[PDB]
Amino acid sequence: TGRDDTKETVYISSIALLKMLKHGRAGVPMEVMGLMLGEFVDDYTVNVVDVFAMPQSGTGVSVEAVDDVFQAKMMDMLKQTGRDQMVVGWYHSHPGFGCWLSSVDVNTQKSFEQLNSRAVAVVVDPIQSVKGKVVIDAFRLIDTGALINNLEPRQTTSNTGLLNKANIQALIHGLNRHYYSLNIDYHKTAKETKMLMNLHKEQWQSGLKMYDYEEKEESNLAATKSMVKIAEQYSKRIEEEKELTEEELKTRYVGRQDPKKHLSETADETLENNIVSVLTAGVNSVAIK
Amino acid sequence: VGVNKDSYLILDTLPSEFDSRVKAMEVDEKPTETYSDVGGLDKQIEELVEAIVLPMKRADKFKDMGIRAPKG
Amino acid sequence: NDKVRFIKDELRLLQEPGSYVGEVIKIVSDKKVLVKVQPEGKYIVDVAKDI
Amino acid sequence: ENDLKDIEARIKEKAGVKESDTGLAPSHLWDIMGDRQRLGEEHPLQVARCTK
């Protein structure tokens, strides 16, 4: 038998993820890059412990814009701090385009694949990470010959995975003609969770701190008026709401957005807002003196 | 100026650009026919040399006398 | 449950990769259609299953 | 007379209307160097003009 290649999932430590985002957005739209320091263990886990950035160029990515001289100095800096392991590949950030390897990027990747076969290329989209999703996808070159022999099915053996394809168009061209994409899981520790979830010093300063009570009166005025308009609209609707076919009523007597529903959202927000506010006043007034 | 197209930074300064049609104005190493392969209409050759050619070379005698040079 | 879980289905709808409006100039019976894209050029391009 | 009007329509509708691509019978293999002219960047070229 030969060597069989099979699924992997690239686990981007919490550290690694922030650095790529920080370095990549900051340098966008000029292309950003850097090496991924980490370790491969297992046969299903690429674990990227850290990344750093290699110096930007206005030739963007190139095979000779990788720059090994800078790589070597950087490696010795990690060596003296006892953090060097194994460079597990390279990442680069396309600006506002999708995750797909460019033709040039294929040859950049071909170089790192010689040095370690388990090397990945991680393509980042930073201007698209300001949604509620962070858009990052991973690729790893597969032998052109292997694709001829139908060895893309080989890469999904021994699990159902979480297989899904987040992007096509240039992606599915490059997969077909070069690569096997990887899904992305995140590693983080229980320490790191607590660091991430904590984002305020005002955690204990937000139910003793209050907003000006003129602002609250303005808010109650605004809220009550809004629901007064929605009630007139509702009242026009509910003069009927009694004939056959719901859908006919929704058109005819506007139940376009349902003024019942609309009033419920508005009612509930200001009602909940006032209970906190009164409770803050009453805590401070009685407790402090 | 050059601006870097990857990310807009004034990179360096470049000569001012004129159209290719305006860059067709200058000579190819234009053949001369001097005043001596133009026979006849002698008085015209003298009147042109006076108007155009000599106020360029002897602009010094124009400033000392204090005249201006013509505009075409 | 219905209220909360249509929102999760609706994120896919909101994160569509664009659309365009075209108008069919003509079909070609190769199983492709000539579309003069309304803001854009002309492209002869593949049909879906739906049509 | 009106039966003739309808069935001309029906005959066109089922036969289908099209435009065919120009071809060549000596060509039944072309992609041997189709991919050499195509397939990545090697390249059909963005046309420019020197201004200076």
Side-chain angles (χ1 to χ4, degrees):
Chain A
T1 55
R3 164 146 177 116
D4 287 329
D5 297 301
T6 198
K7 203 168 300 192
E8 294 184 342
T9 318
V10 184
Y11 294 75
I12 306 203
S13 63
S14 31
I15 316 302
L17 179 70
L18 264 69
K19 291 197 172 295
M20 296 187 285
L21 286 164
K22 170 187 194 269
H23 298 184
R25 203 226 76 187
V28 177
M30 170 186 16
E31 283 187 87
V32 185
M33 62 195 289
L35 305 189
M36 327 174 93
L37 189 268
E39 58 174 313
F40 188 77
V41 288
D42 198 10
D43 194 23
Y44 180 23
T45 317
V46 175
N47 183 35
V48 177
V49 178
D50 180 38
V51 309
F52 46 79
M54 282 282 108
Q56 291 66 50
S57 304
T59 88
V61 192
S62 317
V63 172
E64 289 204 328
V66 165
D67 299 348
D68 296 4
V69 191
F70 301 131
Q71 170 174 3
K73 286 171 186 328
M74 184 63 183
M75 202 66 178
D76 287 335
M77 297 280 143
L78 302 169
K79 190 161 288 187
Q80 294 181 230
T81 45
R83 299 195 272 137
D84 74 314
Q85 291 182 106
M86 168 211 290
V87 177
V88 298
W90 70 297
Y91 70 89
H92 57 299
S93 295
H94 286 42
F97 308 127
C99 294
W100 35 273
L101 295 169
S102 313
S103 306
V104 183
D105 300 9
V106 164
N107 321 304
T108 298
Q109 166 58 0
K110 279 160 45 172
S111 278
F112 284 78
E113 177 73 50
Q114 290 172 254
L115 167 78
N116 173 41
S117 311
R118 296 305 80 163
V120 295
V122 175
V123 180
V124 161
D125 303 344
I127 208 177
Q128 291 189 67
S129 45
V130 288
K131 303 205 292 194
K133 314 303 291 181
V134 173
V135 175
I136 182 182
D137 266 29
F139 312 123
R140 168 177 67 87
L141 184 57
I142 310 295
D143 188 17
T144 300
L147 309 157
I148 302 180
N149 297 297
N150 193 13
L151 295 180
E152 306 201 34
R154 201 168 72 186
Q155 314 301 119
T156 57
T157 53
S158 298
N159 61 5
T160 62
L162 345 149
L163 298 171
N164 67 319
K165 236 352 138 253
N167 185 43
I168 58 189
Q169 286 192 286
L171 199 158
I172 208 75
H173 286 348
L175 187 99
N176 164 241
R177 282 171 204 303
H178 309 86
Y179 46 81
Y180 167 61
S181 48
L182 282 300
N183 304 76
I184 292 179
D185 285 35
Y186 302 113
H187 193 233
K188 58 163 187 188
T189 64
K191 303 204 180 66
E192 282 168 296
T193 309
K194 282 202 259 17
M195 269 188 181
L196 290 162
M197 157 177 234
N198 285 190
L199 286 171
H200 321 288
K201 184 47 56 179
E202 316 292 338
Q203 286 186 38
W204 65 282
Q205 307 295 48
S206 31
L208 311 179
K209 289 188 197 174
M210 70 204 84
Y211 282 107
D212 289 349
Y213 305 81
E214 180 152 85
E215 295 294 293
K216 307 206 175 136
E217 291 198 73
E218 280 302 278
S219 289
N220 294 155
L221 173 64
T224 294
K225 293 331 305 172
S226 295
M227 301 155 64
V228 157
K229 302 184 196 39
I230 296 167
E232 289 189 69
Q233 175 52 297
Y234 182 55
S235 170
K236 178 192 96 66
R237 176 178 186 175
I238 69 186
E239 279 166 4
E240 290 304 294
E241 309 305 289
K242 61 175 52 64
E243 278 180 283
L244 295 173
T245 309
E246 281 288 323
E247 187 51 54
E248 289 187 84
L249 315 159
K250 300 205 300 201
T251 308
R252 279 186 289 161
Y253 308 128
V254 180
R256 311 305 328 151
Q257 307 174 97
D258 301 343
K260 195 164 88 148
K261 154 79 154 162
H262 197 180
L263 203 154
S264 303
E265 303 157 276
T266 50
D268 184 17
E269 54 197 293
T270 298
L271 172 79
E272 64 157 70
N273 182 243
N274 296 334
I275 285 180
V276 183
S277 304
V278 173
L279 189 43
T280 299
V283 156
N284 297 321
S285 298
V286 165
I288 292 162
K289 172 64 163 196
Chain B
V1 290
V3 188
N4 172 241
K5 153 95 201 185
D6 285 349
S7 188
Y8 304 124
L9 284 310
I10 298 181
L11 179 63
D12 65 13
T13 45
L14 309 166
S16 167
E17 78 184 11
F18 309 148
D19 197 8
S20 317
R21 294 166 206 188
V22 181
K23 287 324 282 178
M25 287 186 173
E26 324 206 321
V27 283
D28 57 31
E29 220 219 313
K30 190 76 192 78
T32 207
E33 302 92 58
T34 87
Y35 315 128
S36 324
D37 305 4
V38 183
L41 307 199
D42 297 326
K43 190 176 298 196
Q44 279 44 65
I45 300 169
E46 290 176 83
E47 295 256 79
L48 186 129
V49 173
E50 179 172 53
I52 302 306
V53 175
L54 309 192
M56 295 180 174
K57 292 163 74 80
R58 309 294 292 121
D60 311 335
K61 192 176 48 175
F62 275 32
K63 289 181 284 161
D64 180 40
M65 170 163 33
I67 60 187
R68 49 105 174 237
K71 276 53 179 174
Chain C
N1 186 242
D2 303 353
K3 276 195 306 318
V4 55
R5 292 279 181 286
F6 67 26
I7 314 177
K8 337 286 201 183
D9 295 15
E10 288 162 355
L11 312 179
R12 175 185 53 223
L13 306 178
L14 300 153
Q15 302 181 49
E16 72 160 318
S19 171
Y20 277 118
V21 175
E23 186 152 2
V24 163
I25 294 294
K26 59 190 291 297
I27 58 164
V28 59
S29 299
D30 289 352
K31 196 55 139 30
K32 315 187 189 309
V33 171
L34 179 41
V35 191
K36 168 165 167 46
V37 180
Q38 293 287 125
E40 307 192 92
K42 293 187 191 25
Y43 308 82
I44 292 174
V45 57
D46 293 342
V47 287
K49 285 95 77 171
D50 283 3
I51 56 185
Chain D
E1 288 259 253
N2 304 343
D3 295 331
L4 297 171
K5 287 179 188 166
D6 184 9
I7 196 154
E8 294 309 293
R10 297 183 277 185
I11 289 157
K12 296 190 273 178
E13 198 263 356
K14 298 283 182 213
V17 287
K18 54 166 300 208
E19 205 30 282
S20 22
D21 176 17
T22 52
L24 184 57
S27 309
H28 83 287
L29 168 72
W30 50 80
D31 200 20
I32 186 67
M33 323 184 159
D35 86 82
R36 224 184 112 157
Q37 304 190 307
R38 191 175 48 76
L39 181 55
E41 73 180 76
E42 69 189 324
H43 195 27
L45 303 180
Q46 184 43 55
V47 184
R49 202 162 85 268
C50 198
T51 62
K52 171 184 303 323

